[PDB]
Design an enzyme around this catalytic site. Structure first.
Site, PDB file in Angstrom:
ATOM      1  N   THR A   1       0.641  -1.152  -0.145  1.00  0.00           N
ATOM      2  CA  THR A   1       0.043  -0.010   0.066  1.00  0.00           C
ATOM      3  C   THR A   1       0.757   1.046   0.270  1.00  0.00           C
ATOM      4  O   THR A   1       0.726   2.185  -0.768  1.00  0.00           O
ATOM      5  CB  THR A   1      -1.100   0.147   1.455  1.00  0.00           C
ATOM      6  OG1 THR A   1      -1.746  -1.074   1.138  1.00  0.00           O
ATOM      7  CG2 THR A   1      -1.670   1.360   1.172  1.00  0.00           C
TER       8      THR A   1
ATOM      9  N   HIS B   1      -5.780  14.312  -8.022  1.00  0.00           N
ATOM     10  CA  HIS B   1      -5.849  13.969  -6.893  1.00  0.00           C
ATOM     11  C   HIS B   1      -5.227  12.529  -6.944  1.00  0.00           C
ATOM     12  O   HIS B   1      -5.615  11.452  -7.699  1.00  0.00           O
ATOM     13  CB  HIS B   1      -7.454  14.076  -6.155  1.00  0.00           C
ATOM     14  CG  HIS B   1      -7.642  15.136  -5.855  1.00  0.00           C
ATOM     15  ND1 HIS B   1      -7.786  15.975  -4.665  1.00  0.00           N
ATOM     16  CD2 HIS B   1      -8.064  16.277  -6.867  1.00  0.00           C
ATOM     17  CE1 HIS B   1      -8.100  17.158  -4.769  1.00  0.00           C
ATOM     18  NE2 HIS B   1      -8.544  17.159  -5.989  1.00  0.00           N
TER      19      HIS B   1
ATOM     20  N   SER C   1      -4.405  -1.034  -3.600  1.00  0.00           N
ATOM     21  CA  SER C   1      -3.073  -1.766  -3.277  1.00  0.00           C
ATOM     22  C   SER C   1      -3.192  -3.342  -3.423  1.00  0.00           C
ATOM     23  O   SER C   1      -2.401  -3.792  -3.769  1.00  0.00           O
ATOM     24  CB  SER C   1      -2.683  -1.306  -1.935  1.00  0.00           C
ATOM     25  OG  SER C   1      -2.324   0.181  -1.461  1.00  0.00           O
TER      26      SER C   1
ATOM     27  N   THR D   1      35.410 -39.322 -12.590  1.00  0.00           N
ATOM     28  CA  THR D   1      34.251 -39.470 -11.750  1.00  0.00           C
ATOM     29  C   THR D   1      34.676 -39.741 -10.488  1.00  0.00           C
ATOM     30  O   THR D   1      35.823 -40.442 -10.091  1.00  0.00           O
ATOM     31  CB  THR D   1      33.874 -40.699 -12.464  1.00  0.00           C
ATOM     32  OG1 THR D   1      34.644 -41.761 -12.252  1.00  0.00           O
ATOM     33  CG2 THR D   1      32.952 -40.458 -13.951  1.00  0.00           C
ATOM     34  N   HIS D   2      33.974 -39.243  -9.829  1.00  0.00           N
ATOM     35  CA  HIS D   2      34.410 -39.523  -8.140  1.00  0.00           C
ATOM     36  C   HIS D   2      35.837 -38.668  -8.009  1.00  0.00           C
ATOM     37  O   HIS D   2      36.232 -38.913  -6.847  1.00  0.00           O
ATOM     38  CB  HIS D   2      34.311 -40.729  -7.816  1.00  0.00           C
ATOM     39  CG  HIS D   2      33.237 -41.629  -7.813  1.00  0.00           C
ATOM     40  ND1 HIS D   2      32.736 -42.461  -6.823  1.00  0.00           N
ATOM     41  CD2 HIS D   2      32.541 -41.774  -8.894  1.00  0.00           C
ATOM     42  CE1 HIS D   2      31.621 -43.120  -7.436  1.00  0.00           C
ATOM     43  NE2 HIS D   2      31.384 -42.797  -8.546  1.00  0.00           N
TER      44      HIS D   2
ATOM     45  N   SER E   1      50.239  -9.988  -8.960  1.00  0.00           N
ATOM     46  CA  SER E   1      51.607  -9.794  -8.747  1.00  0.00           C
ATOM     47  C   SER E   1      52.545  -9.927  -9.852  1.00  0.00           C
ATOM     48  O   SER E   1      52.132 -10.483 -10.949  1.00  0.00           O
ATOM     49  CB  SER E   1      52.116 -10.678  -7.616  1.00  0.00           C
ATOM     50  OG  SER E   1      53.380 -10.644  -7.154  1.00  0.00           O
TER      51      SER E   1
ATOM     52  N   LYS F   1      50.076 -17.031 -11.419  1.00  0.00           N
ATOM     53  CA  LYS F   1      48.616 -17.008 -10.599  1.00  0.00           C
ATOM     54  C   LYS F   1      47.528 -16.189 -11.457  1.00  0.00           C
ATOM     55  O   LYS F   1      47.684 -15.090 -11.213  1.00  0.00           O
ATOM     56  CB  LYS F   1      48.814 -16.568  -9.184  1.00  0.00           C
ATOM     57  CG  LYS F   1      48.210 -17.009  -8.157  1.00  0.00           C
ATOM     58  CD  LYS F   1      48.379 -16.696  -6.777  1.00  0.00           C
ATOM     59  CE  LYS F   1      47.461 -17.606  -5.692  1.00  0.00           C
ATOM     60  NZ  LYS F   1      46.072 -17.221  -5.859  1.00  0.00           N
TER      61      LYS F   1
ATOM     62  N   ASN G   1      43.542 -16.220 -10.491  1.00  0.00           N
ATOM     63  CA  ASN G   1      42.438 -16.502  -9.949  1.00  0.00           C
ATOM     64  C   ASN G   1      41.207 -16.569 -10.676  1.00  0.00           C
ATOM     65  O   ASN G   1      40.943 -15.452 -11.569  1.00  0.00           O
ATOM     66  CB  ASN G   1      42.257 -15.294  -8.723  1.00  0.00           C
ATOM     67  CG  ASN G   1      43.492 -15.628  -7.808  1.00  0.00           C
ATOM     68  OD1 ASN G   1      44.304 -16.537  -7.691  1.00  0.00           O
ATOM     69  ND2 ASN G   1      43.708 -14.419  -7.330  1.00  0.00           N
TER      70      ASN G   1
ATOM     71  N   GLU H   1      34.252 -16.936  -9.082  1.00  0.00           N
ATOM     72  CA  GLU H   1      34.018 -16.993  -7.691  1.00  0.00           C
ATOM     73  C   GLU H   1      32.759 -15.753  -7.550  1.00  0.00           C
ATOM     74  O   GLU H   1      32.178 -16.106  -6.734  1.00  0.00           O
ATOM     75  CB  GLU H   1      35.188 -16.174  -7.268  1.00  0.00           C
ATOM     76  CG  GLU H   1      36.510 -17.011  -7.377  1.00  0.00           C
ATOM     77  CD  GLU H   1      37.728 -16.534  -6.639  1.00  0.00           C
ATOM     78  OE1 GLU H   1      38.344 -17.539  -5.920  1.00  0.00           O
ATOM     79  OE2 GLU H   1      37.937 -15.400  -6.434  1.00  0.00           O
TER      80      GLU H   1
END
Lengths: 456, 455, 455, 456
Positions: free
Chosen positions: A97, A126, A137, A184-185, A315, A321, A323, A328
């Protein structure tokens, strides 16, 4: 400041702001956290009023000078001109509302100015009498929810999904010949091509597309025309249908009026079912994202089968490296959609009698997921998916050092000698090639000829 | 038996199997609530027996129940506690939210049975009455919650905690054994600065240690017994000392710090005690999940994975050892998470004086405890105890990494060290080969300077 | 039996009970996975039998298995499908994520049994081999997923959907019967403009109707069978026509639109089909929850509640009728919600070529189907069919309300109507009394003008 | 604009903004949804740097002119002067590197100006070399998470809970004599005082207080001093402890350094355990809120046992309708916390090896719950809880019309006649008084004397 007023007395409202008393009033009652109605919803709420004003005018319930002025005020909100005119929190009344009145007051004050009039109590147009005519509402907010939902899915989620699909589909065909060691596994298994594995990802996305599209017809049902309890009291017979057609025109979506307004007002079933497909997409995306992180993990102490484009500098003394930042961010939002489903379910099942008062929260969570998923796929696509390239030398190194290729020598030297060279290669610590070559069972010419990974 | 006796409640007579101890109500419920296969767990049934047993002793002491009749109901309860009447409780979980039907189930089984100890028989010619005698000064509303907390506290104290402490000790032992074994670190799944296996494992030890405290903190609330509030929690039609007396009794029999709930309305109207307790369980679940995945990933291979560790082969491709214990543990950890949500919905769905979602709450709570308990136990004796390090491979990974380049800084300067690493990367060489290729240091210097023991 | 036979697998010999049909592996698993009480549901076991049965027929047609040996394995499967070997599957849910152990369990039970049909015996002197014969051209990796979807589709088609349609028809019948019964509406829990009971009920009918469509849309994906991809999904060591042939066979036996998965990698690497399907279940759950709460609140009382409706008294304070069927339904609806979360975590936790969280996923999925199925069934025949309106009280509430004040607008004007309502509220009177107190209209006019039939 | 640069090249950054290259870079990569790091976190991240700068200075790792300049820059961020200097989304790297660098660049550029220098590449103070000294995103972000968490709970959640507690406790004592009809299974049960029922609510809150406080000691553990993998490489022995003491000083919280940094870096256990108590509070609040909605439901066709203050004006022709707006907003946020727990759990269990990369999401969800609950209780307290007053006439009307008071006549006229008058009162349709009076069993003097609800 200027003085605004309602049936509860006068209240000072910022002179430079278009809202009225009820908005300024709920502003100091519902002061909870920082979440507010998202743009997509505000626009959808404005579209709802715009369509309603057009229909009222057609039935003679409103004058042309008024309806037209309102429509022009709405289009300004849609043009991002009154974004700061809606300060109400998500944590308000369950029927929404406050937000409805917020849209009404802002829309009425502005329409007054457009009519040579002015903002405040001496307004020409109005809020309740004109902007909120033939509605409540109870039936307006559910409509704004569905209008924002269908549009967000059609205009944002669907497109981003197809884009990510064709991209991974291209990669699938591109790497169709490259063969890699299966898993697998988390253990070394029989081989398969890098292109087939990516084909699993494209298939998953293609399935989620249809599952998302199956939920659309329900979300297309509008509640406008039922009002307070769904009976459609204080309305014209053609109103319900007409406001639905107008909505379909200006949004270009297949919007229809809910067959049963009682179902529309007392539940959020359409959004509980639709979001069910979203968490299913988040589940799919979670794996597709993880396979990338892992396959690309390294560069020396992991799997390192593939390579993804580097985004952030990183770096200097550690150039290797890289990431999986894109993954992520993608998995985090996937946990978020999973968690949003619970919040939605709890709210979608807590309805009572004629109205469900957990709406603002549901639409808040629902729309967040659509933004997260849609933006998440675009961000993942451009800054990762398209840049996926295979590290062919590392792929083969791992295929040759594997002990799973012993299966090919069974239909040649036998199951006895084949499993004999493998058990010796593993136990001692070497390759199958040098293991069979040392046992005199085969020769360098025989091994490299019989052991063909490209033939599975 | 095809033969049935004719027992009856306030609604009429109903055929109960002649070879069963339950009465008219347990049979009427059985025909009205045929939903799924879940039945009340034995751990909760024994908790009910103990509650009824405790009530009898107190009612006797407070001269509300005759000695001969109290010892019969008491003796019948011990019979259930010995695993003699497990087939006498068929009612499913999906019943009355207050667990009234299971309360009646215990009342009737105990009635008919006690009657046979006093020389009488089962059925309508009972010498011992279900409601009048056995459910004396009670209410299925205040009794069920009690059985719940009794079942919940003992499962945590006598099962979960012991197993949690055992796995911890195992893991703690492993940490010291591999305290000198240096290995490549991994953040974001990428190679990072080194750390010994003992340190990587000491992180698991510390997690479980923290979970113990969190689980211990949640016990005092679960220890609060609702038995004494009767109908709406005011304790109408009950002895003033009853509540504290039965709470003391239960405490003596079970050797657990049970106390009477300081506010019965909170005890009768909510499942909050368990909602908070399970919050600790879903925590340990999240912890075990991490511990389980770290193990299977580190043992993945044997050729195309990480393969830094070795796990015992329990199940019967010569070196393909599937991490099955990790798969069982990770699968149940997901289960504990989903149960938390159902407990939340239920525990938050109470109305006025009584929460009527109890059967569903205790089912999920006790299942989670069995899972986390039995899960850690098998994971310990079938995996955690046999964890062995693959020293050869671990060392092979340290050498082929580029993360050890920082050791060359204090000797030749960051810039030369950086160059060496950038070359080794571009051309795919070892830090040794690249360093020698530029002629910045001899091999006799590399093998001295870059000493991985320093991390 | 204390007596045991000596069966053995690749790791050695192990004592299996002489009175059981399972082999060395099912026994070895049993001692390595003692976690909780959950065992594979019968609905899933029969799905496994059907898969093995279907495989035998196809292997015979493709001349890969001798007729005499295929009919024995086929005949043994039908035996399981008749409920004859239910005690032969003890392995718990918490095992290998691929469900290999349960695949072996079926292979061994079927091996030893088929051998007895061919005149031979069980044990090492088998005429039929577990892996070689029964698990011919298969893989526990591609078989389990198939059993899952077979179990899932039939439970939805032959159980859930029929019961959902029945409850709907009941509710639809009630809607027409009470189409003229006007009653006070309630938004935000406060009195609102009126609506007939038929309309309030038609809202439930429409909800369930929508759930049907949503559940029907989720079937085509569940119908996709993974049987044919073997190890990693490439279909290595299998016949080219095998996949489509076994899919057709299963379709013929079960009369369900089963098809072979157009992409095996997606079929083998994920539980997506069920993750999407359960999304439809958690939807119906949320719907039923609303339908259940509306019923108990409307029937609350009998004196200090709403009490607009009456529900049948199933269980044995003269008029205190507890809404027990609503409590069972609402409790299980919470359960279906929590299961969705566990399914999500599992279905999203797959790695590479195979998702190893399957046993946990199917356990939760099949439980939810049993709950929603049996829940709607009992709720229908024990409540939904006996829903009767309390016409007297419903009418008493309409009169004592102030919401009917709008009917006086077209006759005397909004302002006078508003005043009447404001007075009636301040002084606690009926709209009749207040209207008469001011002398704005006679009683003969009120009883004509304010006609509740118009809403 | 001005040109900023890193090891990945130059990048144009707004001249009027204090951030650097990496922030401007991640700004066009991680463009997902609208969620950003909440103020409380930004402040906590600034506090972390401030403390670290103080400690480095003490060990001689930093010069006084630098450390002091940084501390002054931090205090400005804390004074809400650089709120617009952090535009990074929550959906970034799981370690929160982006946000760390964001704080570093903004903090370094400003410290340079304070030192007579200027913002840009010619800066006196350096982000990585000075502001990020002896630390990394891996150990800084988890610390900022805990610092913001403990403080949010101690400074915001705890206080609001006590306030709501004492309020309902006052109401409990106030209405201690008023007796009302009990309710179990939504059915009429034996009576109890309105004060006892409210005492159930106060007891629930009091329990949640201790359960929340039990989780604090764990959240007090800081990771600073472990760096990249938790070994504490490239740091001074006293660093870890010192940065913890400094943190305790400026925040006034009992902050200690984590006993095991490996547990701190690879998990979010402290926040998964702490949020477990929050969902437990949401569960409690959900019921307390619902009992109010229901008890106050009406005003004519519900229970209507109590009356709550009206906030929004509402309709004029329907003065009785008072929607439980405060409860509706409160229950919605309770579903939200429930849903946030799942998202947090999923993220808290998805850690790998040396670091959990679902952090930004967890802190996002965690801090939201603390805001929701804390603000929700204050809003509920002032705009509802304090205004709760009993409708004594309606309470008694329902107590007398009830059939549960027949239990009192059992120890007088017997169980036979008592249950006899009740079964006749129910069946026919009247009160127990007129039922017993008509049967000649009792008289008006006898009934009103024996049937005493105040004696239970």
């Amino acid at each position: 400041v200027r003085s605004e007023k309602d049936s509860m007395g006068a209240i000072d409202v910022p002179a430079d702001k278009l809202w009225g008393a009820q908005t300024q009033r709920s502003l100091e009652h519902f002061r909870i956290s920082t979440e507010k109605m998202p743009t997509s919803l505000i626009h959808a709420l404005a579209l709802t009023k715009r369509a309603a004003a057009k229909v009222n005018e057609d039935l003679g319930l409103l004058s042309e000078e008024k309806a037209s002025a309102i429509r022009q005020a709405a289009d300004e909100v849609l043009a991002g001109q009154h974004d700061d005119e809606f300060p109400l929190a998500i944590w308000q009344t369950g029927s929404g509302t406050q937000s409805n009145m917020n849209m009404n007051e802002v829309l009425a004050n502005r329409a007054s100015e457009l009519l040579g009039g002015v903002r405040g109590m001496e307004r020409k147009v109005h809020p309740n009498d004109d902007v909120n005519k033939s509605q409540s509402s109870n039936d307006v907010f559910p409509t704004a929810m569905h209008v924002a939902a269908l549009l967000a899915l059609r205009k944002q989620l669907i497109p981003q999904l197809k884009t990510l699909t064709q991209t991974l589909n291209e990669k699938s065909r591109a790497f169709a010949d490259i063969v890699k060691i299966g898993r697998t596994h988390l253990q070394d298994a029989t081989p398969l091509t890098l292109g087939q594995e990516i084909s699993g990802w494209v298939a998953m996305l293609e399935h989620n597309l249809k599952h998302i599209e199956y939920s659309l017809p329900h979300v297309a049902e509008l509640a406008l025309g039922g009002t307070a309890v769904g009976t459609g009291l204080n309305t014209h017979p053609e109103y319900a249908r007409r406001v639905a057609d107008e909505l379909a025109v200006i949004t270009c979506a297949p919007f229809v009026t809910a067959p049963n307004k009682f179902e529309a007002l007392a539940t959020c079933d359409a959004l509980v079912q639709a979001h069910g497909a979203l968490k299913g997409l988040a589940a799919s995306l979670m794996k597709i994202a993880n396979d990338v992180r892992w396959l690309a993990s390294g560069p020396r102490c992991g799997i390192g089968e593939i390579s993804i484009p580097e985004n952030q500098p990183g770096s200097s003394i550690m150039p290797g490296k890289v990431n999986p930042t894109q993954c992520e961010a993608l998995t985090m939002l996937c946990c978020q959609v999973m968690g949003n489903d619970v919040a939605i379910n709890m709210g979608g099942a807590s309805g009572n009698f004629e109205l469900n008062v957990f709406r603002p929260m549901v639409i808040h969570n629902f729309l967040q997921s659509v933004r997260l998923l849609a933006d998440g796929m675009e961000s993942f696509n451009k800054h990762c998916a398209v840049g996926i390239e295979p590290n062919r030398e590392r792929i083969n190194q791992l295929l040759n050092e594997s002990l799973m290729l012993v299966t090919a020598l069974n239909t040649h030297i036998g199951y006895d000698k084949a499993a004999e060279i493998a058990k010796k290669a593993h136990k001692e610590g070497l390759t199958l090639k040098a293991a069979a070559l040392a046992l005199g069972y085969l020769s360098e010419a025989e091994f490299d000829s019989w052991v063909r990974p490209e033939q599975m």
